[PDB]
């Protein structure tokens, strides 16, 4: 194909996401930074009442080295996150996460997902109550606020779309409970008829 992706390069991008995005790449497919290569839907309230609780979390996605294991993390902004936690960040068993060390790592391995969202409650007429947690970037403090009223299939927040970070080579990967793209860099091949 001209440009070819050599079997020991690894992603400059690994982008992680739910099962329910779609796709707007395939694999092979050669992108431009700057390209829509996904999109998450829309979030709708699965039932009617208030809102009575907006707060500030960090969601963390650690995975093991061999990828076997994976686990998620919703941590309040309030127990304290080190700003030196990012996306490759090696992390060990046993230590915290977070500063009060209410949180603790259960995983050898590293970072791969790392977001500021909004942890939105909902509560029914009769007391019951649903979590959503809310990407910032999808996230509209004039309609998700607490003491506001949703209804059952309202949008609370606008479908999220995610753009190439760098250009190069896609590889798609769907999980059962995950979605990744990875962007891959190609080296130019040796003219050969």
Known sequence: PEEVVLD???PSERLILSPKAKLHVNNGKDVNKG????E???I????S???????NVRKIVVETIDRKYTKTYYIPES???EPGLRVGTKVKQGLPLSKNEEYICEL???????????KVVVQTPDGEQDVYYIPLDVFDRDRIKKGKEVKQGEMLAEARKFFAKVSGRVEVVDYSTR???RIYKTKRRKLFP
């Open 8 to 10: 020991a390069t690894s």
């Open 35 to 38: 390209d829509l290569i996904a």
């Open 40 to 42: 998450e839907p829309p």
């Open 44 to 47: 709708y309230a699965r039932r």
């Open 49 to 55: 009442g208030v809102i009575v609780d907006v707060k």
């Open 79 to 81: 127990a304290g996150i």
């Open 108 to 118: 050898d391995g590293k970072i791969v997902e790392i977001e500021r969202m909004k």
């Open 179 to 181: 979605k990744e793209i």
